[PDB]
């Protein structure tokens, strides 16, 4: 929880010897390997790129075993939805990092053709490309959050900071490169009043502000194909990373659980001109006391 | 008229594959299926061979065009696709029946070591199978010498009859010309290293050094794989992995090369080798020591590319031998005059001059790295591979270069930044010298920062 | 049959060029189309980091002659193969001895077009797997170098061609997988990408199909 993975990682290592079932095994191996893969980043350096890169896979290499092993984990009781989901977007997201510094590596590393944006063709559509995959992630992380609805108030807030760094890669990335003219934005934001409620956080909207405000000093001096440019993302990628993960409670441990169990009027032939009038049915079900974090009070059905 | 067609064919499509069935060779080609069927194998079997097969297509196109308008033509008396259904039912008219290998393998042994060998069985078979070594299919060459090899039949074992029996046979005196030229021929079609070594070893051995006629047509078209062709050369000689074959493919290359150098050497002025040929590559080179020869540039060019190699790794006689004679010591080269009009032309273009310099043999690039142009010199100086010492001796040379007449350099110069900046990267990497041209360069072009 | 190692491939990655200097040469050959792209064109970089590190690409390269060719390759006019090509495309829309006995233009003009057929026909299809598409090329050992090097400008320089499809078409032909392996080796940063394209055709095991 703190980020101290490390020292978790080797209790957790210790940890499976002693117990007794097998989903709990992969279960804790599972943490291990997630301990071990953040650890992982705890040997990134400033402006060392190379370092990044090698950093980044060994991380996700023991991220992957890590899922592995956890997919492994689930039961029809107990599955480990939320686990497998943030695990899987944190997957996504260091395979995204890893494939914007490769590109900015390949801003140099494959130099453009002939052609008299343009004229840099492929870093700009490979630019494009991690564009549309970092706000994909965003839009994945909303869903989660949108899915958690038993989660306490501070695993959410830690997707959604999850989320605004998916943004803040992706924004970056449009201002810097692909669209700098029609993004003349101010970061005119209240920042005074940021109550960060944990060291996590506060280190999150820290190098928020800073990604932004060098993004905003960077609005349109250069050509958008200047080393600047893989510079800034680079830093921003180091920096968003340095910053440890942080699993929360709804990760480890579920309360105000609910569900629907969704009944209705049951290869079902029906006349075209009689056409079906539905009766559908739910009660809402909770573990323990029904409204602890959340009150539920609709249910919006939509169907298609 | 497509009716007519399909009603003939069953005639002879659908007969076996023996002889008297379609009248031996006329009534066959007229049968469209036949036709077809022959016109298809004669097709399947370079740039100018490329255009007559297009002529053939066209032809084919037109004979179908004009089979269309006899359909037609038949259809108005009558009153009074086509090609794809002809086609089709040649395909599956189901001819052919049998060629079943062992009866015809065992067949074909009679034909030449058996007491019915003669030399027509030997020289029959030789113009059919032997002919197909030159065709543009790889797997008409592979079929061929897997046919020959096991029919027939240290080092390139598959390839040994070649090199061990054959020339041994007495069915070689009498049909060695026909052999020499199509394996001559093939040298140009033949793809695998092994292979060409085979054919170069075998041309080296068992040639007609003697006639003239073989032996200047031979070292021609020698002279053609061992300049035209490079990458078969480049894999055959990779200076990375050296092998003894290698040694032992070039010792032979070399021996070829003297023996020619030697017989031209020894040609005369007024005799027959002197002719007003239609080829444009004869060059009379005429030597410093007064004797006469007439030999082809590009010949002159196998020569010399041929010393760019290196020493045998086993023998170093011929090679010496050659170097002496080629490019002498403390002497002047010799003059070669265009046969065309008598006049004096060039004997080491660039292309030639970059192996020159690049090749360790210090003759050789002495010899180059006199009296270079500074066009040249750019030239030279712009291109890799060269060692370290050719590099800084060369850039020595330059360095006497601008120190003598700047003027025509930086006249030439269309731009002085990446230059500088490859002249550096030469300067550091091991090479000592050059820092004038450097430092001039520096002088109008000040470091700058990035 | 030599493939890149996966520590040139990984060193050419993150561009660390201080142990690209530890290289074997025959290694070297397989990565240097790319290599003498970087130290030869438009940097459009401009870092004194880079200057250095395109010095030290130049210093490395130097030493090798297969350079010249590449060279040779690379002072065509592109325009008139983008247009040749196009031309043709829209037009449908022993080889070799001729790669021994060409120009570098012709040799481009030829691959390209030998190169589009074979896409054009596999997006034709429906993945019906025509292993058979041509094997002129691919097949003799002489023309395994050079030919994987004039790709790897041919899908660089006219970049129009794209990586996905070039690697999807090595995949029909006899011998592309290492022509693949060694495309990746020089475009680094598109093997997430090549992967991924690479996945969405198949399945099953097609009953270990071809």
Redesign the interface.
């Known amino acids: 929880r703190m980020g101290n993975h490390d020292m978790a990682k080797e209790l957790y290592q210790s940890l499976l010897t002693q117990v007794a079932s097998e989903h709990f095994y992969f279960w804790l191996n599972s943490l291990k390997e997630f301990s071990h893969a953040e650890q992982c980043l705890t040997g990134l350096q400033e402006e060392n790129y190379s370092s990044a890169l090698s950093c980044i896979a060994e991380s996700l290499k023991f991220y992957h075993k890590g899922i592995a092993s956890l997919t492994a984990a689930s039961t029809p009781l107990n599955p480990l939805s939320f686990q497998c989901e943030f695990v899987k977007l944190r997957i996504d997201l260091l395979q995204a990092f890893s494939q914007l510094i490769c590109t900015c590596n390949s801003l140099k590393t494959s130099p453009p053709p002939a052609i008299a944006l343009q004229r840099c063709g492929r870093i700009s559509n490979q630019m494009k490309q991690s564009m549309e995959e970092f706000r994909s992630l965003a839009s994945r992380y909303g869903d989660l959050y949108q899915a958690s609805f038993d989660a306490d108030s501070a695993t959410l807030r830690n997707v959604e900071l999850q989320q605004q760094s998916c943004l803040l890669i992706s924004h970056a990335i449009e201002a810097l490169i692909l669209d700098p003219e029609s993004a003349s934005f101010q970061e005119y934001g209240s920042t005074g009043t940021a109550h960060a409620d944990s060291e996590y956080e506060r280190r999150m909207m820290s190098v928020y502000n800073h990604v932004l405000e060098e993004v905003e000093s960077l609005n349109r001096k250069y050509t958008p194909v200047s080393y600047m440019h893989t510079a800034c993302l680079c830093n921003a990628i180091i920096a968003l990373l340095k910053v440890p993960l942080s699993f929360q409670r709804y990760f480890f441990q579920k309360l105000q659980s609910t569900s629907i169990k969704l009944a209705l009027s049951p290869p079902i032939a029906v006349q075209n001109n009689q056409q079906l009038a539905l009766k559908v049915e739910g009660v809402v079900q909770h573990g323990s006391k029904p409204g602890l974090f959340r009150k539920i009070q609709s249910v919006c059905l939509n169907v298609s | 008229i497509s009716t007519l067609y399909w009603k003939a064919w069953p005639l002879l499509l659908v007969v076996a594959a023996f002889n008297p069935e379609n009248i031996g060779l006329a009534a066959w080609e007229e049968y469209p299926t036949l036709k077809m069927l022959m016109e298809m194998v004669m097709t399947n079997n370079?740039?100018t061979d490329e255009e007559t097969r297009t002529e053939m297509l066209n032809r084919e196109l037109q004979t179908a065009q004009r089979e269309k308008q006899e359909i037609l033509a038949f259809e108005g008396h009558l009153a009074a696709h086509i090609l794809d259904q002809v086609k089709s039912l040649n395909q599956s008219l189901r001819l052919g029946h049998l060629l079943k290998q062992r009866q015809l393998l065992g067949r074909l042994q009679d034909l030449l070591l058996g007491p019915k060998a003669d030399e027509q069985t030997t020289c029959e078979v030789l113009d059919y199978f032997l002919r197909r070594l030159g065709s543009?299919?790889?797997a008409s060459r592979v079929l061929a010498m897997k046919g020959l090899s096991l029919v027939l039949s240290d080092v390139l074992q598959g390839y040994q009859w070649l090199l061990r029996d054959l020339p041994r046979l007495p069915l070689f005196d009498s049909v060695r010309s026909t052999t020499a030229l199509a394996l001559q021929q093939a040298i140009?079609?033949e793809?695998?290293?092994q292979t060409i070594s085979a054919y170069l070893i075998y041309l080296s051995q068992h040639t007609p050094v003697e006639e003239q006629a073989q032996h200047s047509d031979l070292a021609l078209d020698v002279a053609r794989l061992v300049v035209?062709?490079?990458?078969?050369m480049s894999?055959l000689f990779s200076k990375?992995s050296p092998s003894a074959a290698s040694d032992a493919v070039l010792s032979a290359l070399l021996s070829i090369f003297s023996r020619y150098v030697r017989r031209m050497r020894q040609s005369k002025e007024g005799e027959e080798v002197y002719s007003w040929s239609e080829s444009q590559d004869q060059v009379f080179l005429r030597w410093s020591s007064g004797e006469t020869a007439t030999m082809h540039i590009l010949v002159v060019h196998a020569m010399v590319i041929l010393l760019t190699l290196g020493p045998p790794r086993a023998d170093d006689s011929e090679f010496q031998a050659l170097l002496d004679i080629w490019f002498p010591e403390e002497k002047p080269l010799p003059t070669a005059f265009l046969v065309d009009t008598s006049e004096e032309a060039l004997l080491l273009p660039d292309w030639l001059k970059?192996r020159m310099i690049?090749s360790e043999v210090l003759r050789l690039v002495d010899a180059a790295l006199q009296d270079l142009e500074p066009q040249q010199l750019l030239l030279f100086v712009q291109?890799?591979?060269?060692p370290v010492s050719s590099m800084s001796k060369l850039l020595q040379f330059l360095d006497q270069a601008v120190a003598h007449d700047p003027q025509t350099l930086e006249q030439n110069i269309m731009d002085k930044n990446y230059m500088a900046?490859?002249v550096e990267?030469?300067h550091?990497?091991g090479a000592s010298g050059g820092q004038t041209f450097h430092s001039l360069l520096t002088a109008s072009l000040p470091p700058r920062?990035? | 049959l030599q493939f890149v190692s996966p520590f040139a491939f990984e060193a050419m990655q993150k561009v660390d060029v201080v142990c690209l200097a530890s290289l074997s040469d025959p290694e070297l050959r397989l990565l240097l189309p790319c290599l003498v792209r970087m130290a030869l064109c438009a940097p459009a970089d401009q870092s004194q980091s880079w200057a250095q590190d395109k010095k030290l690409i130049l210093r490395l390269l130097s030493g090798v002659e297969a350079v010249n060719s590449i060279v040779a390759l690379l002072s065509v006019d592109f325009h008139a193969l983008e247009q040749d090509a196009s031309k043709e495309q829209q037009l449908r829309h022993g080889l070799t001895l001729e790669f021994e006995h060409s120009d570098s233009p012709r040799r481009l003009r030829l691959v390209l077009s030998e190169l589009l057929a074979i896409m054009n026909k596999v997006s034709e299809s429906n993945g019906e797997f025509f292993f058979k598409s041509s094997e002129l090329f691919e097949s003799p050992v002489y023309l395994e170098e050079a030919a994987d090097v004039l790709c790897i400008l041919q899908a660089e320089l006219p970049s129009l061609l794209p990586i996905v499809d070039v690697a999807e078409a090595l995949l029909h032909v006899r011998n592309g997988a290492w022509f693949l392996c060694l495309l990746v080796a020089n475009v680094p940063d598109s093997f997430n990408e090549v992967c991924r394209g690479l996945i969405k055709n198949g399945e099953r095991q097609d009953e270990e199909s071809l």
Not at chain 2, 228 to 232: D, M, P
Not at chain 2, 383 to 386: D, L, N, Q, R, T
């Open positions: 370079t740039l543009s299919q790889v140009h079609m793809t695998d290293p035209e062709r490079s990458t078969i894999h990375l970059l690049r291109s890799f591979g060269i900046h490859l990267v030469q550091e990497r920062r990035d």
